Coordinates of C-alpha atoms and ligand atoms in Angstrom, one line a residue:
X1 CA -9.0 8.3 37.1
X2 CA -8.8 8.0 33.3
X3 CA -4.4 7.0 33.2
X4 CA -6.1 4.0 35.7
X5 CA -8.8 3.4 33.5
X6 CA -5.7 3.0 30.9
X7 CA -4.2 0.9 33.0
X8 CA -6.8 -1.6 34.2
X9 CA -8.3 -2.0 30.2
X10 CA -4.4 -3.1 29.1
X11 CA -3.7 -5.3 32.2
X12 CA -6.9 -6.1 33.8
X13 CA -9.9 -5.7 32.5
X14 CA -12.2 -7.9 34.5
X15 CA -11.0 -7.5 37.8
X16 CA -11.6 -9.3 41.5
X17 CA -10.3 -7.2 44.7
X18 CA -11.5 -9.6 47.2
X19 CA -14.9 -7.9 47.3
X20 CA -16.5 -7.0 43.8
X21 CA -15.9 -7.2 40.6
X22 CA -15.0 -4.5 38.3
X23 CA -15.1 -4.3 34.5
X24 CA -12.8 -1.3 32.2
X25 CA -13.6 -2.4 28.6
X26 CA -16.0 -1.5 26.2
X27 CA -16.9 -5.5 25.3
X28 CA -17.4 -6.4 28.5
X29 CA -19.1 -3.8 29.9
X30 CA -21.7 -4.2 27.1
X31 CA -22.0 -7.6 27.5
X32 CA -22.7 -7.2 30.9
X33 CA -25.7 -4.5 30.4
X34 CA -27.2 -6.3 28.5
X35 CA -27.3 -9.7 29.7
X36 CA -30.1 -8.9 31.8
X37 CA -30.5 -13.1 32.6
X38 CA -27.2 -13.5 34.2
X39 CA -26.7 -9.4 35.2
X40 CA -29.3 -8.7 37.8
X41 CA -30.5 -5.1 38.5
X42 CA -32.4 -6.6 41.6
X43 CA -30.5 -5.1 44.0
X44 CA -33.5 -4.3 46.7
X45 CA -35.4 -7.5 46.4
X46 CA -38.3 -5.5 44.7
X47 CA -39.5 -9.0 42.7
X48 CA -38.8 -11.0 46.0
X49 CA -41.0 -8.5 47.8
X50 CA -43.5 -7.7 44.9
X51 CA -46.6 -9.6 46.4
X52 CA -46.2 -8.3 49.7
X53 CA -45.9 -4.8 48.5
X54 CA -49.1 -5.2 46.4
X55 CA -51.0 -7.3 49.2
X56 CA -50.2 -4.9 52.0
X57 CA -48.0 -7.8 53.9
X58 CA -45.2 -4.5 53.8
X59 CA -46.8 -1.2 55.5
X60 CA -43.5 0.6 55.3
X61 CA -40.8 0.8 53.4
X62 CA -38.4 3.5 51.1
X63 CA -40.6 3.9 48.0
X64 CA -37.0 4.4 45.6
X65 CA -35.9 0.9 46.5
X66 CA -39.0 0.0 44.6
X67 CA -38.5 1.2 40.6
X68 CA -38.0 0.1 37.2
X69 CA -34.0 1.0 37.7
X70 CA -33.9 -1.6 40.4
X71 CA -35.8 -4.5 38.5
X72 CA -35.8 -7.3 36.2
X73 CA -38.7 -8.5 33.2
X74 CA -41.3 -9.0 33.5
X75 CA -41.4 -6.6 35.9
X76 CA -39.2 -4.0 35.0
X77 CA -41.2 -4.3 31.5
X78 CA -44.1 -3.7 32.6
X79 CA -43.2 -0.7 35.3
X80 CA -41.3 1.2 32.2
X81 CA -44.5 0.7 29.6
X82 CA -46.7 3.2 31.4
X83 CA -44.5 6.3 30.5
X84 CA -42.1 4.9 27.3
X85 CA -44.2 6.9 25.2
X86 CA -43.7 10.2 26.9
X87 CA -40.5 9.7 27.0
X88 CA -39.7 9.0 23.2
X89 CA -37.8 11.4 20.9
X90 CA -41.5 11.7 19.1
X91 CA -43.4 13.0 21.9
X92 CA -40.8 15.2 23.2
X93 CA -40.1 17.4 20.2
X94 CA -44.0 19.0 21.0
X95 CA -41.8 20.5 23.9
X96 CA -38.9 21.7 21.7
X97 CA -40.2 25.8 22.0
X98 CA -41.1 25.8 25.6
X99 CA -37.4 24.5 26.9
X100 CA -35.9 27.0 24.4
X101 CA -37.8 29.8 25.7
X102 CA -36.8 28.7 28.9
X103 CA -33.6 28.2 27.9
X104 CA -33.3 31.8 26.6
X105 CA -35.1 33.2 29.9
X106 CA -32.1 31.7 32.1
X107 CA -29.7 33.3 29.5
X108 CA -31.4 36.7 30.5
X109 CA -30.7 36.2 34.4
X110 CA -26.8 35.6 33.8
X111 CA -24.4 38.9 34.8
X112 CA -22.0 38.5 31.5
X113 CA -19.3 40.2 34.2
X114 CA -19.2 37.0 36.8
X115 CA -21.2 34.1 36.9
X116 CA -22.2 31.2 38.3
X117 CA -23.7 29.0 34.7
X118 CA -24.3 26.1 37.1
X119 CA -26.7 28.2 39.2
X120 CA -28.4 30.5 36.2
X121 CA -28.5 27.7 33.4
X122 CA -27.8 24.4 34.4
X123 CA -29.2 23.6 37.7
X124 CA -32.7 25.3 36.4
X125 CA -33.7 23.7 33.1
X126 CA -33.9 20.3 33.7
X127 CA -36.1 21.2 37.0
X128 CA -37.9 23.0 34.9
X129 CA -38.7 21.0 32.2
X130 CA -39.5 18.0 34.2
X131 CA -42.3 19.9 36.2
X132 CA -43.9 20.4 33.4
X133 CA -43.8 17.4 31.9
X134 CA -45.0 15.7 34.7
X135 CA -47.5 18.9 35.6
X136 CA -46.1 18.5 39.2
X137 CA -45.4 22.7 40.4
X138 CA -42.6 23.9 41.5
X139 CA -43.5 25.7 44.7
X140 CA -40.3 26.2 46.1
X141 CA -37.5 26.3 43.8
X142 CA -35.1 25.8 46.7
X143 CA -36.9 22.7 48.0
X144 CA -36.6 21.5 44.2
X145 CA -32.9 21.3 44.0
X146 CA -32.8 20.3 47.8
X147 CA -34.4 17.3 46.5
X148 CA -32.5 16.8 43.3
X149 CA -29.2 17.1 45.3
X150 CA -30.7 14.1 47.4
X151 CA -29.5 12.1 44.3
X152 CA -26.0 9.6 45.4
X153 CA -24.0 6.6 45.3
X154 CA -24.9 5.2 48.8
X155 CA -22.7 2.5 50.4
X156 CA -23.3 -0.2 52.1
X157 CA -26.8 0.0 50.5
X158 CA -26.6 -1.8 46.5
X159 CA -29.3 -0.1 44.6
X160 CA -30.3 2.8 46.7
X161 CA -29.5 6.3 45.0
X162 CA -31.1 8.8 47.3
X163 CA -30.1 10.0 50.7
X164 CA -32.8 9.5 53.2
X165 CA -33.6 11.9 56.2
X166 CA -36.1 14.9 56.7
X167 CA -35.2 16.6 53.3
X168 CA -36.4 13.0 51.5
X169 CA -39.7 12.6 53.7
X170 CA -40.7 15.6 52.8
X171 CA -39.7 15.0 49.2
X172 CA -42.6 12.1 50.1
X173 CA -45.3 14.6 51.4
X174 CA -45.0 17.1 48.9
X175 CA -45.6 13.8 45.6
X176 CA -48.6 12.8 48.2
X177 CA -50.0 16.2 48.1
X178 CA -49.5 16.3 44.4
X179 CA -50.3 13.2 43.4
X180 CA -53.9 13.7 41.8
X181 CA -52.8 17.1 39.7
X182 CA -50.5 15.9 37.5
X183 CA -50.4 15.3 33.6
X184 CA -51.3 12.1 32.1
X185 CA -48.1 9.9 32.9
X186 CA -48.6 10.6 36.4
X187 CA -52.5 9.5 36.0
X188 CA -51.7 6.4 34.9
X189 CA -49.0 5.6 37.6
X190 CA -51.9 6.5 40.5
X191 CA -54.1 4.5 39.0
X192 CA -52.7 2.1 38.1
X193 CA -52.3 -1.2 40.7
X194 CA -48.9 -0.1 41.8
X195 CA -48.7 -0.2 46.0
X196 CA -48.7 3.2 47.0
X197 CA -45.2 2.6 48.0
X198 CA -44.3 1.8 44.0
X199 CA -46.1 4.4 43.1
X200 CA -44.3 7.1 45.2
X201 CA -41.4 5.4 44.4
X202 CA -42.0 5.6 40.5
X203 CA -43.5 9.7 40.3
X204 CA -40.0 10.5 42.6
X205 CA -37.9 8.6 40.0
X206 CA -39.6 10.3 37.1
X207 CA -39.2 13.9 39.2
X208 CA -35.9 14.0 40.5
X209 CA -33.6 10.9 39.6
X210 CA -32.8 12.6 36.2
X211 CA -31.8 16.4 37.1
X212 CA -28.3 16.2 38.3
X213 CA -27.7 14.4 36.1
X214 CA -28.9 16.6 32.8
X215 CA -27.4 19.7 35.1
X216 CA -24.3 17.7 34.6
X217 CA -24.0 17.3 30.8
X218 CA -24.6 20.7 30.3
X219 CA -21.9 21.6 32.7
X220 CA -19.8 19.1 31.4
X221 CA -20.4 20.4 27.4
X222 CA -19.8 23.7 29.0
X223 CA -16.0 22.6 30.6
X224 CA -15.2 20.1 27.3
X225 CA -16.3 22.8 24.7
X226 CA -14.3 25.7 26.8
X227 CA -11.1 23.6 27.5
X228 CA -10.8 22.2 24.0
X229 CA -11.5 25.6 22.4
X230 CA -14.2 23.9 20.2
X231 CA -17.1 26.8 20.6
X232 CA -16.6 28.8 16.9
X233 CA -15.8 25.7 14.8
X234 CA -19.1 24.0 17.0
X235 CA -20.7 26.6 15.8
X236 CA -19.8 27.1 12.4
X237 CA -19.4 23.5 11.3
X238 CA -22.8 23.1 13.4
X239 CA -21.7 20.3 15.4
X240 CA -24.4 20.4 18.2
X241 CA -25.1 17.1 17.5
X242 CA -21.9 15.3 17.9
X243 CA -20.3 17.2 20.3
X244 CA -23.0 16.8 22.2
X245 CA -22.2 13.4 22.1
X246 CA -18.5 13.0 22.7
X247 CA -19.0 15.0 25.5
X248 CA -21.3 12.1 26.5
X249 CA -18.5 9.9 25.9
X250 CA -15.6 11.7 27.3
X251 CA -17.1 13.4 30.6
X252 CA -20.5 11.1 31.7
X253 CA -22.5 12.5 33.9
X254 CA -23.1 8.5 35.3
X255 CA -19.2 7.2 35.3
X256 CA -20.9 3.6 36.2
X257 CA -23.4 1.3 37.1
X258 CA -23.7 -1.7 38.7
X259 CA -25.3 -5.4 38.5
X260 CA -25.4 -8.8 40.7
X261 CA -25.1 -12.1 39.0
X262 CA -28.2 -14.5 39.1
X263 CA -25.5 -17.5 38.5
X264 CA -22.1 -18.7 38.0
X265 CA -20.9 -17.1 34.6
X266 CA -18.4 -16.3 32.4
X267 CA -16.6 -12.7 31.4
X268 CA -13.7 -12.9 29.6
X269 CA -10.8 -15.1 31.3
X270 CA -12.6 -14.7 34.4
X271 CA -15.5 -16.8 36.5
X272 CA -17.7 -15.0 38.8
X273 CA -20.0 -16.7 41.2
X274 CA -23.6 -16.3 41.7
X275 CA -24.4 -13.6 44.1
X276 CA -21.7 -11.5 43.0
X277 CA -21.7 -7.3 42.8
X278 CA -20.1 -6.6 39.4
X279 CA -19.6 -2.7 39.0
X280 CA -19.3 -1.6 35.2
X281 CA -17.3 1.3 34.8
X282 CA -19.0 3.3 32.0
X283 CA -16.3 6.3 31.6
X284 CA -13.5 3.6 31.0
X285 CA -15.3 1.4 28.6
X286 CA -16.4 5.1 26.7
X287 CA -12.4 5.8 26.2
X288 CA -12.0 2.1 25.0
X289 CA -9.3 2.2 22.1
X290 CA -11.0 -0.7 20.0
X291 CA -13.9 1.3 19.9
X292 CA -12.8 4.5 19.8
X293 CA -10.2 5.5 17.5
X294 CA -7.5 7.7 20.0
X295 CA -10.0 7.4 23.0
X296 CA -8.3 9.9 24.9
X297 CA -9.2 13.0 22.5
X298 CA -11.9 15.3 22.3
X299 CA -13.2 15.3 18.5
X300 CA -16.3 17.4 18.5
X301 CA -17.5 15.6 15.0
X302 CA -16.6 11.8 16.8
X303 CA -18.0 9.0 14.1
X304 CA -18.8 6.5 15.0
X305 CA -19.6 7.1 18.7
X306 CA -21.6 3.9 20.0
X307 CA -21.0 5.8 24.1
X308 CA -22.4 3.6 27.4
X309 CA -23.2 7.2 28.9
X310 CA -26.7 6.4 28.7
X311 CA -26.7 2.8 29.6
X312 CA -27.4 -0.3 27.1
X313 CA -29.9 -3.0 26.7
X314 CA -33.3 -2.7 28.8
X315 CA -32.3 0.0 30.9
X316 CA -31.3 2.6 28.5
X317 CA -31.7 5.3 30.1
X318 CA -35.9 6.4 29.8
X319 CA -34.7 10.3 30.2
X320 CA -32.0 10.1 27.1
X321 CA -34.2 11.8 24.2
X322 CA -34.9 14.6 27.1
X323 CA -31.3 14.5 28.1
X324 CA -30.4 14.8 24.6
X325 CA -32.9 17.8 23.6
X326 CA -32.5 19.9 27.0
X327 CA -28.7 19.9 26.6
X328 CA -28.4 20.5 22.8
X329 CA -30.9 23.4 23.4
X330 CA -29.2 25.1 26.3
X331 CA -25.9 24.4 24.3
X332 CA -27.4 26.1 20.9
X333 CA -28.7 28.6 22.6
X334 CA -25.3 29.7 24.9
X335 CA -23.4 29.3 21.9
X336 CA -25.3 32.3 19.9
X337 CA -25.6 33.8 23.0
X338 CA -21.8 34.5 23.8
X339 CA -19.1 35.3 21.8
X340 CA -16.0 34.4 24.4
X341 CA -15.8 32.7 27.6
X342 CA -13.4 32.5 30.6
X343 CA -13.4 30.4 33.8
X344 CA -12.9 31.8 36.8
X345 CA -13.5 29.2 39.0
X346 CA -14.8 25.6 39.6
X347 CA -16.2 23.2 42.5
X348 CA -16.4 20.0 41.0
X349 CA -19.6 17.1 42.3
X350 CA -17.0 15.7 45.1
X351 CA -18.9 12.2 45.6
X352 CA -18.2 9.3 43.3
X353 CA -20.6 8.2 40.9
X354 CA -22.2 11.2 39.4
X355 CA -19.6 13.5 37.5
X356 CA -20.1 17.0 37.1
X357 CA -19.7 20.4 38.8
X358 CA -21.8 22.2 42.2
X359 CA -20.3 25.5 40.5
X360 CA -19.1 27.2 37.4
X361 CA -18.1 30.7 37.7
X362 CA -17.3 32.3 34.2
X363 CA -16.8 35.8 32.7
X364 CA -18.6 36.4 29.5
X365 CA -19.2 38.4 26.6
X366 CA -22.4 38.6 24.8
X367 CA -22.9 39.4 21.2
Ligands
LIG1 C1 -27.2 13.4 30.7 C2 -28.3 12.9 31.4 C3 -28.5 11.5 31.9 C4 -27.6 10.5 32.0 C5 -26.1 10.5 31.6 C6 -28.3 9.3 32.4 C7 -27.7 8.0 32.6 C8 -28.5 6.9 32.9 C9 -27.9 5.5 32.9 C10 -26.5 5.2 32.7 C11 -28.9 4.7 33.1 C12 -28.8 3.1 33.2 C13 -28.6 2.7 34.7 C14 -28.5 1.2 34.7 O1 -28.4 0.5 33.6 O2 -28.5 0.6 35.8 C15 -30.2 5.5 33.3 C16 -31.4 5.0 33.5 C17 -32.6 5.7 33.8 N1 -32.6 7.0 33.7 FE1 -31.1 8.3 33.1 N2 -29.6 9.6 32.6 C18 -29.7 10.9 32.3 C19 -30.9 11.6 32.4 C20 -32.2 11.2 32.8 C21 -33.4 11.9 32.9 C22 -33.6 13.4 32.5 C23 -34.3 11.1 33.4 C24 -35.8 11.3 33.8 C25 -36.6 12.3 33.5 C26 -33.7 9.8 33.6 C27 -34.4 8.7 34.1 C28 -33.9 7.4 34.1 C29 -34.7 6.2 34.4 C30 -36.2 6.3 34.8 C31 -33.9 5.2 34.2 C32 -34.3 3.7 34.4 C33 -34.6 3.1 33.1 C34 -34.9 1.6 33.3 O3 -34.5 1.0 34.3 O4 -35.5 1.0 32.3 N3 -32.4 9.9 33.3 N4 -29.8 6.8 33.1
LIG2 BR1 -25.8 7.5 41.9 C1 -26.9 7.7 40.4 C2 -26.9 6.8 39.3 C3 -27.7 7.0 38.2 C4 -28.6 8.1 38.2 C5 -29.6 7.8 35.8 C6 -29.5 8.4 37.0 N1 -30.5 9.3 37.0 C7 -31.1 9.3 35.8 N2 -30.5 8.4 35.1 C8 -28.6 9.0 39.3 C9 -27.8 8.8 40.3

C-alpha cells in the first residue's frame, strides 16, 4: 500500500481511473474535507429525502443511510448539536476512573502465557464504555460485537457502512426495545422531531459505528509500539500522548473517506465534474513528506503531527476525545502492566477501509 501511496503523492496526486477520483497528498486531501460546499457527504440523499422522512411520505427505509456522517449544514449541524457536548474532551474526563477500572479488569482476564489482546482488551473496552455512556445494556456481549463487526466499506452502495441482513434487524429491535432507558443523549434523540427512522439511525451510529474502530487503535498502538521497540523509552520518557498520536498517523484505523462534488471544481492541476465520487485517502496524505518530516518513520515524540486519522473540518470525528482517552488508558495501563512482549500470531481486518487486526495472539510477562 504505503511504497503506492509513495508513488501516487510524487507522480499523481489527484488522480482519474475512468471511474472516481482519488487524492494521495496531505493539501489536497484537506482541502477536500473541508470544503464542505463543493465536497458533499450526501451520499444517500438524506437532505433530498428529509421531508418525506419527517412527513411519513417514506414508511421504510435503512435507518444508517440517514446520519449526521452522511449529511450536509444545515442539517448535519443541527443532527450533531444534540450530543457535541457529551462528546467533548470536558465531559468525558468525569469517565476517566470507570474506563480505567475497566481497563485494569480486562488486564486481569489475560493468560500472560498465550493470548489473544484483541479478544481480552481491545475488542471489550470501547463496547464497554459506549454502553455506558449511552446507558444502553449489554445483554449479550456476543450479540454486541456481532453488531460492531457489522461495521464495512460496502460497494456499490456510496455512504452505507453497515452490512444489512438478520444480524442488522435485529441490531434494530434490540435500539427499539431500548430506546426509552437510556441516558440523557439518547433522551434527547427520542424526543426530539427526528423520524423514527433518523432516530434509529442516529442511537445505532452513536452505539456501534465507533467500536471497531477504537478496537483498532489500540491494536494498532499495540503492533507499532511492539514492532518499533518503543514500550520502555514510552514509558519512561512518558510519551502516551504522542505516540498515541503517530500511531494515529502511521497505522489509521479509517485509511479513507469519501465525498461527491456538488459542482464543477478545481483540485490541483485537475477538473472534476459535478457528480463526481472523489475518495480521499487519509493513510497517504498522514505519511505526506511536506508535512511530516521522514513520513515513513515511527517517532513516538512526532511534533508537529497535524494527522487526518480523525477526519477535518465539520466532520471531525464526534468519538475522537473518547477515541483518544479509551486508547491512551488501555495503553497506560498495558504498559505498567507488562514488562516484555512477544507476538505469536496475527489475523489482520481483511476488508478495505477499516485497518486493524480480528486477532493478536502474544506471550507476556507481567511485573
Ligand atoms: C480511533 C478511533 C476512531 C477513528 C480513527 C475515527 C475516524 C473517523 C473519521 C475519519 C471520521 C470522518 C468521516 C468523514 O469525514 O466522512 C469520523 C466521523 C465520525 N465518527 Fe469516528 N473514529 C473513531 C472513533 C469513533 C467513536 C468511538 C465514535 C462514537 C462513539 C465515532 C463516531 C463518529 C461519528 C458520529 C462521526 C460523524 C461526525 C460527523 O459527521 O459530524 N468515531 N470518525
Ligand atoms: Br467503512 C467505516 C468508515 C468510518 C467509520 C468513523 C467510523 N466509525 C466511527 N468513526 C466506520 C466504518
Amino acid at each position: 500500500m504505503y511504497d503506492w501511496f509513495s508513488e501516487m503523492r510524487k507522480k499523481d496526486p489527484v488522480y482519474y481511473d475512468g471511474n472516481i477520483w482519488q487524492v494521495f497528498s496531505y493539501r489536497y486531501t484537506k482541502e477536500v474535507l473541508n470544503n464542505f460546499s463543493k465536497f458533499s457527504s450526501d451520499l444517500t440523499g438524506y437532505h433530498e429525502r428529509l421531508e418525506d422522512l419527517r412527513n411519513g411520505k417514506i414508511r421504510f427505509d435503512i435507518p444508517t443511510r440517514y446520519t449526521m456522517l452522511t449529511s450536509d449544514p444545515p442539517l448535519h449541524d443541527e443532527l450533531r448539536s444534540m450530543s457535541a457536548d457529551i462528546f467533548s474532551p470536558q465531559k468525558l474526563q468525569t469517565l476517566e476512573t470507570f474506563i480505567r477500572e475497566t481497563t485494569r479488569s480486562l488486564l486481569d482476564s489475560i493468560d500472560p502465557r498465550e493470548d489473544d489482546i484483541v479478544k481480552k482488551l481491545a475488542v471489550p473496552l470501547p463496547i464497554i464504555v459506549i454502553s455506558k455512556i449511552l446507558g444502553l445494556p449489554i445483554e449479550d456481549k456476543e450479540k454486541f460485537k456481532e453488531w460492531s463487526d457489522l461495521v464495512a466499506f460496502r460497494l456499490g452502495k456510496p455512504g452505507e457502512i453497515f452490512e444489512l441482513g438478520k444480524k442488522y434487524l435485529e441490531l434494530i429491535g434490540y435500539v427499539k426495545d431500548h430506546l426509552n432507558s437510556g441516558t440523557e443523549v439518547v433522551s434527547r434523540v427520542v424526543n426530539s422531531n427526528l423520524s423514527d427512522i433518523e432516530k434509529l439511525g442516529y442511537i445505532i451510529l452513536l452505539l456501534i459505528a465507533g467500536n471497531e474502530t477504537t478496537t483498532n487503535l489500540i491494536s494498532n498502538s499495540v503492533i507499532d509500539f511492539t514492532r518499533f521497540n518503543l514500550w520502555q523509552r514510552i514509558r519512561e520518557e512518558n510519551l502516551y500522548l504522542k505516540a498515541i498520536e503517530e500511531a494515529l498517523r502511521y497505522s489509521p484505523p479509517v485509511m479513507r473517506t469519501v465525498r461527491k462534488t456538488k459542482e464543477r471544481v478545481k483540485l490541483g492541476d485537475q477538473t472534476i465534474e459535478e457528480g463526481e465520487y472523489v475518495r480521499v485517502w487519509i493513510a497517504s496524505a498522514n505519511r505526506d513528506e511536506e508535512v511530516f518530516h521522514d513520513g515513513e518513520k515511527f517517532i513516538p515524540d512526532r511534533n508537529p503531527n497535524p494527522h487526518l486519522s480523525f477526519g477535518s473540518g465539520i466532520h471531525l470525528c464526534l468519538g475522537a476525545p473518547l477515541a483518544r482517552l479509551e486508547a491512551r488508558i488501555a495503553i497506560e495501563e498495558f504498559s505498567k502492566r507488562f514488562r516484555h512482549i512477544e507476538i505469536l500470531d496475527t489475523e489482520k481486518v481483511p476488508n478495505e477501509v477499516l485497518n486493524g487486526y480480528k486477532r493478536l495472539v502474544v506471550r507476556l510477562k507481567s511485573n
